[PDB]
A paper describes a structure:
[name] encodes two separate bbk32 orthologs denoted [name] and [name]; however, the activities of these proteins are unknown. [name] and [name] both bind human complement C1r and protect a serum-sensitive B. burgdorferi strain from complement-mediated killing, but surprisingly, differ in their ability to recognize activated C1r versus zymogen states of C1r. To better understand the observed differences in C1r recognition and inhibition properties, high-resolution X-ray crystallography structures were solved of the C1r-binding regions of [name] [name] and [name] at 1.9Å and 2.1Å, respectively. The crystal structures presented here of [name]-C and [name]-C show that a defining feature of the C1r-binding domains for BBK32 and [name] Fbps is a four-helix core with an extended second alpha helix that presents a functional arginine residue on a small surface-loop.
A structural overlay of [name]-C, [name]-Δ5C, and BBK32-C shows that the three proteins retain an overall similar structure around the conserved R248 residue (BBK32 numbering). However, we noted that the area near BBK32-K327 involves a minor structural alteration in [name]-C and a more major alteration in [name]-Δ5C. In [name]-C, the kinked portion of alpha helix 5 extends one turn longer than in BBK32, resulting in [name]-C containing an additional surface-exposed residue on this helix. Each of these key residues are conserved in [name] (i.e., R264 and K343), whereas in [name], only the arginine is conserved (i.e., R309). SPR binding assays showed that [name]-C and [name]-C bound with high affinity to C1r-CCP2-SP with K D = 0.90 nM and 1.4 nM, respectively, whereas [name] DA-C exhibited no detectable C1r-CCP2-SP binding. As expected, in light of the C1r-CCP2-SP binding data, [name]-C demonstrated potent inhibition of classical pathway-mediated complement activation (IC50 = 23 nM), whereas the [name] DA-C mutant lost all inhibitory activity. Interestingly, while [name]-C was able to bind to both zymogen and active forms of C1r readily (C1r zymogen K D = 0.85 ± 0.036 nM, active C1r K D = 0.39 ± 0.049 nM), [name] selectively interacted with active C1r only (active C1r K D= 1.1 ± 0.042 nM). [name] [name] conferred levels of resistance comparable to BBK32, while the [name] DA strain was as sensitive to serum killing as the vector-only control. Similar to what has been proposed for B. burgdorferi BBK32, the anti-C1r activity found here for [name] may selectively protect [name] from CP-mediated complement killing.
Author numbering: 222 to 371
Write the structure that this text describes.
Amino acid sequence: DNRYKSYLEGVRYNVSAAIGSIDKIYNNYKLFEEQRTKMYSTRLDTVTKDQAKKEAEKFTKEELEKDLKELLNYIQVSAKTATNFVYQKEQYAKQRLDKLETEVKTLISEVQGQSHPYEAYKAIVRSKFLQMKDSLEVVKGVIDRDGPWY
């Protein structure tokens, strides 16, 4: 019905948003790591090291924690709406979102434990983080299709 379409539209919206968060954090980590390496390089001059230090100092622990909180919020709202997908073609999305919610809660718990930006990033971009985009893309494929599942 039209109510079900509204549920699909909202989950699609939030899962896309979550994937944006996953892409943002990972890329922020990559850039942070690149700039940190430069800033401590033995083969680079002070001008270059200085610029790297300035770019590295922008990656705060607070931005990461807020990014993970945003990610959790999009996923947890989606998981609740996805109860409606039980016994429907999109059902597989419900279990995957519940499990992602649990996993992102763990990452937030990790980031709080750490005090410095680089170590917080290093603690959270590991095995389970690095499968999250793939899992959300599985969800996306379940909830937003333009033809059969081949």
